[PDB]
C-alpha cells in the first residue's frame, strides 16, 4: 500500500490515496489507508 500510495502520489502531488483494491485470481484484497490507521479486508470473489 505504501508503494502503491507513492505510485498514485507521483502522478499528482495534491492527490492522496483514499482507497485501494487488488483483485487476485482466487481472492479480492481491499485496503483502506488513513494516516492514523489502515483497514485491510480479504473477500473471496463470488
Amino acid at each position: 500500500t505504501k508503494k502503491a500510495r507513492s505510485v498514485v502520489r507521483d502522478l499528482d502531488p495534491t492527490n492522496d490515496l483514499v482507497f485501494l483494491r487488488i483483485q487476485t485470481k482466487l481472492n479480492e484484497i481491499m485496503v483502506a489507508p488513513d494516516d492514523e490507521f489502515s483497514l485491510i479486508v480479504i473477500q473471496t470473489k463470488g
Binding site: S6, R9, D10, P13
Partner: protein, 51 residues
C-alpha cells in the same frame, strides 16, 4: 746531546701547539608516526516527486 734527544728537544710548547676540535652533532632519535584518513560512512537517499 744525542740526535734523537735534539729532535725531541727541537719540539717546544710554544714551537708546537695541539688543539682538539669537534663538530656539534644532534642526538639520533627514533619516532613512529601513523596517519589514518577521516572515517567515511555509507549514505542511501531516495527522492520522489511527492517527497
Amino acid at each position: 746531546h744525542d740526535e734523537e734527544a735534539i729532535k725531541q728537544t727541537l719540539r717546544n710548547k710554544f714551537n708546537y701547539n695541539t688543539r682538539e676540535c669537534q663538530t656539534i652533532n644532534p642526538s639520533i632519535r627514533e619516532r613512529g608516526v601513523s596517519t589514518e584518513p577521516p572515517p567515511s560512512d555509507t549514505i542511501c537517499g531516495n527522492i520522489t516527486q511527492w517527497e
